[PDB]
Design an enzyme around this catalytic site. Structure first.
Site, mmCIF file in Angstrom:
data_model
loop_
_atom_site.group_PDB
_atom_site.id
_atom_site.type_symbol
_atom_site.label_atom_id
_atom_site.label_comp_id
_atom_site.label_asym_id
_atom_site.label_seq_id
_atom_site.Cartn_x
_atom_site.Cartn_y
_atom_site.Cartn_z
ATOM 1 N N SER A 264 25.876 81.273 19.127
ATOM 2 C CA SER A 264 24.281 80.872 18.831
ATOM 3 C C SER A 264 23.328 80.850 19.254
ATOM 4 O O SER A 264 22.049 81.394 18.744
ATOM 5 C CB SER A 264 24.208 79.574 18.453
ATOM 6 N N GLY B 42 28.528 78.990 17.937
ATOM 7 C CA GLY B 42 29.656 77.878 18.008
ATOM 8 C C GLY B 42 31.120 78.634 19.569
ATOM 9 O O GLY B 42 31.677 78.225 19.455
ATOM 10 N N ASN C 182 28.959 75.148 24.610
ATOM 11 C CA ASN C 182 29.997 75.133 23.599
ATOM 12 C C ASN C 182 31.584 74.086 24.172
ATOM 13 O O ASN C 182 32.086 74.051 23.422
ATOM 14 C CB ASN C 182 29.856 75.206 22.633
ATOM 15 N N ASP D 280 16.817 70.767 17.015
ATOM 16 C CA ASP D 280 17.670 69.979 16.908
ATOM 17 C C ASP D 280 18.492 69.647 18.162
ATOM 18 O O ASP D 280 19.578 69.164 18.182
ATOM 19 C CB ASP D 280 18.853 70.429 15.830
ATOM 20 N N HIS E 125 19.145 74.034 19.132
ATOM 21 C CA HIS E 125 19.088 75.771 19.097
ATOM 22 C C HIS E 125 17.517 76.342 19.157
ATOM 23 O O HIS E 125 17.062 74.824 18.606
ATOM 24 C CB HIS E 125 19.273 76.109 18.002
#
EC number: 3.1.1.47
Length: 212
Positions: free
Chosen positions: A43, A70, A100, A188, A191
């Site tokens: 991402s 992801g 990830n 968040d 990101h």
């Protein structure tokens, strides 16, 4: 095996086949285009395309963005082996994956990143490879920060002796003195906001311009 370096697609456990749809789109892109630069990763790569820094900084470079939210290293490795590097001859491949890789040690994740560089060196030997450092994450100090830091150290050490492999730490200093990451930079704590992407993309663009 190192699960981080064993190529495998993402298994669809939800039902709408979106991961495989994305992979197929990128394969079609490579088939039909002639990029000078291809960006691949998770991402952090994917959302870089949702401009509005992509059109001004990277579009002019003749670039394709194969980021998929992801993805871990093994997923990117599989995609590169299964069509996304076909029909093209880029000058540079930009790689940004590893954050990830939950359940994998920092050493394993490094092994995954090195496997991706090796694959690229085999399939697209003329291309320079740029690997971005994993960014810190989480609002406060936490194990993933240490993990991602350690991956960066190991990857940096690994690429140091690699004439056309370049490690880039694009982190302008997101972790502040008090140990926090601002939601202004990462909405968040993972990101990047538009504000967060600016110095990251600026750093990347400069490097790409040198190399190019």
């Amino acid at each position: 095996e190192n699960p981080a370096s064993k190529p495998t697609p993402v298994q669809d456990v939800q039902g709408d086949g979106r991961w495989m749809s994305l992979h197929h789109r990128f394969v079609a892109d490579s088939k039909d285009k002639e990029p000078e630069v291809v960006f691949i990763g998770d991402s952090l790569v994917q959302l870089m395309h949702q401009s509005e820094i992509w059109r001004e900084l990277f579009s002019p470079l003749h670039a394709l963005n194969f980021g998929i939210g992801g993805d871990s290293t093994q997923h990117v490795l599989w995609r590169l082996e299964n069509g996304e590097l076909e029909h093209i001859r880029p000058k540079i491949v930009v790689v940004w994956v590893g954050t990830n890789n939950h359940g994998h040690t920092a050493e394993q994740v490094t092994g995954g990143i090195k496997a991706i560089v090796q694959l690229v060196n085999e399939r697209q030997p003329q291309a320079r490879v740029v690997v971005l450092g994993l960014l810190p994450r989480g609002q406060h100090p936490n194990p993933l920060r240490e993990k991602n830091r350690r991956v960066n150290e190991l990857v940096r050490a690994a690429l140091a002796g690699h004439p056309r492999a370049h490690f880039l730490d694009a982190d302008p200093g997101f972790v502040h003195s008090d140990g926090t990451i601002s939601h202004h930079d990462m909405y968040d704590y993972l990101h990047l906001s538009r504000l967060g992407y600016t110095p990251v993309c600026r750093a990347l663009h400069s490097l790409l311009l040198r190399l190019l």
